[PDB]
Design a protein around this ligand. Structure first.
Ligand SMILES: Cc1cc2nc3c(=O)[nH]c(=O)nc-3n(C[C@H](O)[C@H](O)[C@H](O)COP(=O)(O)O)c2cc1C
Ligand SMILES: Cc1cc2nc3c(=O)[nH]c(=O)nc-3n(C[C@H](O)[C@H](O)[C@H](O)COP(=O)(O)O)c2cc1C
Lengths: 187, 187
């Protein structure tokens, strides 16, 4: 083992957050870690829009709910008509990770960046979670108008988001185990 | 800074490899790191097929060339008719990372796993590179027959591969810099 290997195993998806905002230096380190992810052809066409403002996060969540309210999926209409659903779990920071959809691997660039950010965050004692609700909603007219106002490029799609914060006091995680049999070694 | 942050910045794509195979314990640590990646809904539907046999790697590369020889893309026909092209750069190990294509985020699961593996490898002094040539070729009949024989599930597509090895003696990398302006912070 080593610190990297242990941080990789220790990374978890956290869905309950303290109100305290993370420090600017930590946010910069986490975003830089995403920036250093591999990208196809070294295109670096991604954008990372770190939203740290509680009012704007709440407004964006309302727009996402509004998009869901338009859906036929029962689970999605239920979110859309909820008075409590918050896709980012009241994390104080959400990083919207977007890319142009030109290359077929566009989302994999983003996932690499996102995984770096999770690991960077874990190494700094900062909880994180993948927030996926902008993938299918980013082209809803009201959601898109909101994203544009935040600085997400209009020609980008949103491939994933990163919630960041401190784990809520007394929030306990399920013990992690992984599926045996995902690995084949051919000698 | 910390070891995780530094390992993240230090990770590079390496395309020249020594002949020495990596140690079994390192390979297991790297694969475990992939296994601990986040996956949508915790489905863990991915498979990791670590191919450590030079003969089989060469045969697989021939099949990939054969698929490319069928293409119209000039760059791909050139690879297909090459006597020297090797998509995995003669790395002693290639990990084929596959998933069922049921969910739209299938490839992002794989990219998360792959990024963990890169970082795990870097932390152990093991060079790595994303090898993308099975994404568009995995359903070619001869390539697919080969993948099946290696143990890649027949219902999976290949979203990315990881070359692993030691960097060739005297192989020098271009200094890494990242694009300024990919980050927007909204306070
Ligand atoms: C592509 C993808 C999308 C995900 N989307 C969400 C999501 O929108 N909301 C959420 O709470 N967790 C999301 N997750 C987190 C997974 O549920 C989590 O990784 C899985 O349950 C394993 O738990 P762990 O991260 O603690 O290892 C997503 C993960 C992946 C990789
Ligand atoms: C989705 C994706 C696909 C890639 N495919 C290949 C490839 O097939 N062959 C290769 O040599 N490098 C591949 N790369 C590596 C990129 O070229 C590399 O990440 C980029 O040039 C930045 O260099 P660095 O990894 O040293 O930071 C791929 C990277 C990404 C994320």
């Amino acid at each position: 083992t080593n610190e990297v290997l242990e941080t990789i195993k220790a990374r978890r998806s956290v869905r309950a957050y303290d109100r305290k905002q993370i420090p600017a230096d930590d946010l910069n380190a986490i975003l830089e870690a995403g920036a250093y992810a591999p990208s196809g052809m070294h295109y670096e066409t991604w954008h990372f829009t770190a939203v740290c403002n509680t009012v704007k996060l709440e407004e964006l969540n309302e727009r996402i709910k509004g998009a869901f309210a338009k859906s036929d999926d029962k689970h999605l209409r239920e979110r859309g008509h909820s008075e409590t659903y918050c896709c980012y779990y009241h994390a104080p920071t959400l990083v919207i990770v977007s890319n142009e959809p030109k290359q077929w691997w566009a989302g994999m660039d983003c996932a690499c960046a996102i995984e770096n950010m999770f690991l960077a965050a874990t190494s700094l004692g900062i909880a994180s979670c993948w927030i996926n609700q902008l993938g299918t909603t980013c082209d809803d007219p009201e959601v898109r108008a909101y994203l544009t106002s935040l600085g997400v490029p209009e020609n980008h799609k949103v491939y994933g988001c990163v919630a960041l914060g401190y784990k809520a006091e007394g929030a306990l995680l399920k013990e992690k185990t992984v599926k045996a049999g995902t690995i084949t070694i051919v000698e």
